Design a protein around this nucleic acid. Structure first.
Ligand SMILES: [K+]
Ligand SMILES: [K+]
Ligand SMILES: [K+]
Ligand SMILES: [K+]
Ligand SMILES: [Mg+2]
Ligand SMILES: [Mg+2]
Ligand SMILES: [Mg+2]
Ligand SMILES: [Mg+2]
Ligand SMILES: [Mg+2]
Ligand SMILES: [Mg+2]
Ligand SMILES: [Mg+2]
Ligand SMILES: [Mg+2]
Ligand SMILES: [Mg+2]
Ligand SMILES: [Mg+2]
Ligand SMILES: [Mg+2]
Ligand SMILES: [Mg+2]
Ligand SMILES: [Mg+2]
Ligand SMILES: [Mg+2]
Ligand SMILES: [Mg+2]
Ligand SMILES: [Mg+2]
Ligand SMILES: [Mg+2]
Ligand SMILES: [Mg+2]
Ligand SMILES: [Mg+2]
Ligand SMILES: [Mg+2]
Ligand code: NA
Ligand code: NA
Ligand code: NA
Ligand code: NA
Ligand code: NA
Ligand code: NA
Ligand code: NA
Lengths: 81, 68, 123, 95, 50
RNA sequence: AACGUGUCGCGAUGGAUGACUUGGCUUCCUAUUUCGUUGAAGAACGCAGUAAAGUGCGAUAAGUGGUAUCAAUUGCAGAACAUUCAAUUACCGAAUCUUUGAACGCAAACGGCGCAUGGGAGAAGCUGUGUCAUCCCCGUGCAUGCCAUAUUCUCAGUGUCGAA
RNA sequence: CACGAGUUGUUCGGAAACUGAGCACAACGUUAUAUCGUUUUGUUAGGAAAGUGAAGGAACUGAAAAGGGGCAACAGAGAACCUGGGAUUAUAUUCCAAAAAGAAAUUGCAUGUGGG
RNA sequence: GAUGUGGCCUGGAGGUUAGGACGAAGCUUAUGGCGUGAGCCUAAGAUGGACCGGCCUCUAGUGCAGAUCUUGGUUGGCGUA
RNA sequence: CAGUGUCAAGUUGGCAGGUAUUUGUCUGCCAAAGUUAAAUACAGAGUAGGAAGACCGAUAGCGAACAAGUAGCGUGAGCGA
RNA sequence: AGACCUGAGUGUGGCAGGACUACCCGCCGAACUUAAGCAUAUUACUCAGCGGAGGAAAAGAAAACAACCGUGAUUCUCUCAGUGAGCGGCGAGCGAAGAGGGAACGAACUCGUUGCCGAAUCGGGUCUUACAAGGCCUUGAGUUGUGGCAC
């Protein structure tokens, strides 16, 4: 019977963790990520979901290198005499 | 664009500047200009200059003057 | 404990010796940090760590400056490891330099000299 | 070389062996099996752990048993040779 | 079961390490707004599914 | 009389209202203002005496260096150059910067496995010392394509010639 | 719920290191678009994809060998250990210490004895 | 259904006049007075703790009883099934 | 403008001159390589600084005044206090 | 023998892929909707999709307008103008340009060709305090033509 019993029938998992984005969207059989399209070189990006783009874009991480180079640009790549 | 002969040539070193990266992808070569209609000027090209989108933008946007 | 001035005045072998001693001391303090220990003993872990950081800072600054002056000579400049070259930005590194930017044809130079831009006024 | 940082060989054993353990099981292994218990670097080798034991405590490790704890750290059960006493080494360590 | 990749084991280890209450001295601090960890996790309430 | 009704005083439950706003929204301006193979954005894991989250940082890890500033930080603890060597702050030229990721030696629900090349450690034998096979550890290089190039490298073609 | 602990391997399972149904990097082609197609019926690609056994005077040179590189089985293939313990609060063919409780098997290098 | 109203009311602005720790806003009422009414004003708090009223003009996200209305809370059924 | 077919002329020449054609005058210009600052955009971007508002005032204003793209949900794309 | 010229291998030096994507440039490309139905039309050369750059981009120095007493690269603003233009089941609807006042403006240059030369050019080593717009060397590239000069 569909419903409760068949909920009991569900074994395994379609997805596991993605090495690239970490979202548990990596299709095990197809070996590609449903969230970031890994291992394709470029990431998934669709304008019909600006919300997902705003979730994933630059600035939602720590920007560990971007902050430093932004400071260096702001200071005109100043160097000791 | 990395060859020193190119970079030190005033006749061709304009193309080293990054605004010309993949200019063919943006229709900026002679063939691209041809299919953009940019072989024509004046009354044969008024709706497509400086581009179709540019002319559509300035012909279709609603202007709200401050005192109107 | 190690003042940075003493470390600047210190040799590379002596710097490595004092790095070994400070590492050993931090290890012993980790042992103490496992078996309880007094607040005074636990409270020197951070000075030891910052001193180790200072010794490594002096060592690496000295090594990088010496290497930069090694590859600065005409003979070895073009083989400089990319970690020692100026970073700036990717686009700036690829961009035309002022000398390349300012190249002119000989006709352009003759024209620029023949008719220089003038300063003038009107009454 | 594109790696310029000053790395010294005289402090690697301090990374390999982090600190000893003092739990009841560890103490019982010290007394009864001549075995010291350490938290070690999780990426470290059994062979490197033996070498670091020699370098740091001047003692011979006859057997290193390792496990990664459910908290993510690697623990080493190190039996010393019968020429060395685990209790004396633990005392010098301060255990 | 017995099998897990070491990476999954490390993620589960970090989740175990995070499943701790707030120290009380954190509540004694000057501008403090935290009193419970609020990200506490019980194995029966919510799944990590690693 | 008992439930039950009404009204008033006082309580409870419940969090509206008012004052408060280090927030939002909208408008305007100034610039030596625009990332990445010199490895980015993003993911992951760690780092404090005490430390879950968050913030900050990267095995130099709630930070190193420098220039200013001048007496703290503060929940406790700990520390105690002051004419500036401060767990102060601010800013920035020097440094550091784990596993990844375009990810690029090959793979990967594997903290996996190589080739070349530099090193390190190294039992037993040898004169405590050096030396060191197998094993082990670390650095560097090694994807594909394209451009240039070879103080003029090595080749292929029943392509076209041609030797003396 | 709070505090403090607990998972021990030459041989067990995996991987190093097999092939299967299959997958699809490269290559090539296609597509305005590669985020498409082909890719085991012995097998990629108009397709020059092999880089080293030897020698010969210690690492430098090179024959013949047709059809590039990977992945996909924790129940197929494969795989050298097994009893005793008075040995835990919780692990154990994983721990036990010279009378290893002990008994083995099996790799990789080296050292001797001996050979016909 | 149309229209009028030196008609009522609310948040802000330009003016002008006031008030407040000797107690502002808010909130409570067998708390009276005024108005046909929208409402206004006083009193009392054995309430509160810091802002705010009137008048002219300007301005708007400006007035609720119901939309199987939205969100939060409560509630009889019920010490029941 | 594009595909395909077909394809010139040579300044006694071409192109344009907003009703097709064949003539013959006139006017402007010289396609089928290329570079170029400013005045313009920023209609869901960023970096470093600034200035404001007749705007909103915790069910409002961004979803988010707070360890908020968090807790939680979904196999997932996503959803989201 | 050898050559060039077509194509390989390796060494050396370098570059591209990713991110952002508000605005901008190239393609691709709807339907709801409106027409009181609906198919042309409209929505719309829009959304969604695929590419590419910047601090802006794109455009830009007349094979331009005009028909004047003439203007004079581009871009932008008011206006021309919801138009006695035009397009349109001539329905619903749609829809510009020149001139004029202005912002900006030191705005102009390069090649190819022609004709006069013809390696005077480039790269690479190496000296000058110097990967010099310099000297010296150099077959390496280039005569299947780089570079100079002129209207
Ligand atoms: K579930
Ligand atoms: K309020
Ligand atoms: K209708
Ligand atoms: K004008
Ligand atoms: Mg194990
Ligand atoms: Mg699992
Ligand atoms: Mg923490
Ligand atoms: Mg790859
Ligand atoms: Mg519990
Ligand atoms: Mg197969
Ligand atoms: Mg396999
Ligand atoms: Mg096995
Ligand atoms: Mg009525
Ligand atoms: Mg309002
Ligand atoms: Mg309203
Ligand atoms: Mg009503
Ligand atoms: Mg251009
Ligand atoms: Mg609230
Ligand atoms: Mg809100
Ligand atoms: Mg439609
Ligand atoms: Mg609509
Ligand atoms: Mg219909
Ligand atoms: Mg679009
Ligand atoms: Mg531009
Ligand atoms: Na993309
Ligand atoms: Na199980
Ligand atoms: Na625990
Ligand atoms: Na109401
Ligand atoms: Na055509
Ligand atoms: Na890119
Ligand atoms: Na850019």
């Amino acid at each position: 019977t569909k419903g409760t019993t068949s909920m009991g029938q569900r074994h395994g998992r379609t997805h596991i963790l993605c090495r690239r984005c970490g979202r548990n969207s990596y299709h095990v059989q197809w070996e590609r990520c449903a969230a970031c399209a890994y291992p394709r070189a470029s990431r998934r990006r669709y304008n019909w979901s600006v919300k997902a783009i705003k979730r994933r874009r630059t600035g939602t991480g720590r920007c560990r290198y971007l902050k430093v180079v932004n400071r260096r640009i702001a200071n005109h790549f100043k160097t000791p005499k | 664009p990395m060859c020193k002969t190119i970079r030190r040539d005033p006749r061709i070193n304009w193309i080293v500047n990054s605004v010309h990266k993949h200019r063919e992808q943006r229709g900026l070569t002679s063939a691209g200009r041809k299919h953009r209609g940019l072989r024509h000027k004046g009354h044969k090209a008024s709706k497509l200059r400086p581009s179709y989108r540019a002319a559509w933008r300035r012909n279709n946007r609603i202007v709200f003057l401050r005192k109107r | 404990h190690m003042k940075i001035k003493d470390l600047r005045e210190k040799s590379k072998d002596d710097l490595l010796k004092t790095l070994t001693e400070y590492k050993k001391e931090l290890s012993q303090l980790r042992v103490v940090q496992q078996t309880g220990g007094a607040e005074t003993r636990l409270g020197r872990i951070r000075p030891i760590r910052k001193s180790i950081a200072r010794i490594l800072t002096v060592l690496n600054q000295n090594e990088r400056s010496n290497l930069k002056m090694f590859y600065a000579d005409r003979k070895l400049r073009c083989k400089t490891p990319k970690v020692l070259r100026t970073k700036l930005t990717h686009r700036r590194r690829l961009a035309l330099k002022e000398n390349e930017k300012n190249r002119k044809t000989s006709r352009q130079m003759r024209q620029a000299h023949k008719f220089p831009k003038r300063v003038y006024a009107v009454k | 070389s594109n790696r310029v940082t000053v790395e010294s060989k005289d402090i690697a054993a301090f990374n390999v062996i982090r600190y000893p353990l003092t739990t009841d099981k560890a103490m019982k292994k010290i007394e009864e099996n001549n075995t010291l218990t350490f938290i070690v670097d999780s990426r470290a080798n059994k062979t490197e752990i033996k070498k670091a034991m020699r370098k740091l405590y001047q003692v011979k490790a006859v057997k290193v048993n390792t496990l990664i704890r459910p908290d993510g750290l690697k623990k080493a059960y190190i039996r010393l040779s019968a020429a060395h006493d685990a209790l004396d080494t633990a005392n010098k360590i301060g255990l | 079961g017995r099998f897990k990749p070491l990476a999954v084991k490390k993620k589960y280890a970090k989740k175990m390490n995070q499943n701790k209450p707030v120290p009380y001295w954190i509540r004694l601090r000057t501008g403090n707004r935290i009193k419970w960890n609020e990200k506490r996790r019980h194995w029966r309430r919510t799944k990590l599914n690693y």
